[PDB]
C-alpha cells in the first residue's frame, strides 16, 4: 500500500498524477463547504421575469415592493 505506491510513482508518474487528480475531482466537492454556494448562486441568477402574485390579502412573506424587508435576500452573496 506504500511500496506499490512508490513503485508506480517511480515508473508511471503521469498515471499517478492522473488518478490522483481524478480522485480529488471525485471526492473533494463532497467535502467542500462552498459547494452549497454554487447552488445558491445559480438559483440567485434571474434569467426570467419575476412574475408577481395576485394579492389575495393573506401573504405575509411576499413583499409589495423590491425595497421591502420580506422576500429573498442576497446579503450572503455581497458579503461571503
Ligand X SMILES: CCCCCCCCCCCCCCCCCC(=O)OC[C@H](COP(=O)(O)OCCN)OC(=O)CCCCCCCCCCCCCCCCC
Question: In angstroms, what is the minimal distance from the CB of 56 to ligand PC1?
Answer: 28
Question: In angstroms, what is the minimal distance from the CB of 12 to other proteins?
Answer: 9
Q: Which is nearer to ligand X, 8 or 74 (CB)?
A: 8
Q: Which residues contact 44 (CB under 8 A, 6 or more apart)?
A: 72, 74, 77
From residue 15 to residue 54, the character string flagging contacts with ligand X as x (rule: CB under 6 A) and all else as - is: xx-xxx-xx--x----------------------------
Tell whether the torsion through CA atoms of 3, 5, 6 and 8 is positive or negative: positive
Task: Please report whether residue 25 would count as binding ligand PC1 according to CB under 6 A.
Answer: no
How far apart, in whole angstroms, are the C-alpha atoms of residue 72 and residue 34? 20
Look up residue 32 and give its three cell numbers: 467542500
Amino acid at each position: 500500500v506504500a511500496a506499490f505506491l512508490k513503485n508506480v510513482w517511480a515508473k508511471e508518474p503521469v498515471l499517478v498524477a492522473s488518478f490522483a487528480i481524478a480522485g480529488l475531482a471525485v471526492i473533494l466537492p463532497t467535502l467542500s463547504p462552498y459547494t452549497k454556494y454554487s447552488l445558491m448562486i445559480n438559483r440567485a441568477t434571474p434569467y426570467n421575469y419575476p412574475v408577481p402574485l395576485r394579492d389575495d390579502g393573506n401573504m405575509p412573506d411576499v413583499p409589495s415592493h423590491p425595497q421591502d424587508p420580506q422576500g429573498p435576500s442576497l446579503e450572503w452573496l455581497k458579503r461571503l
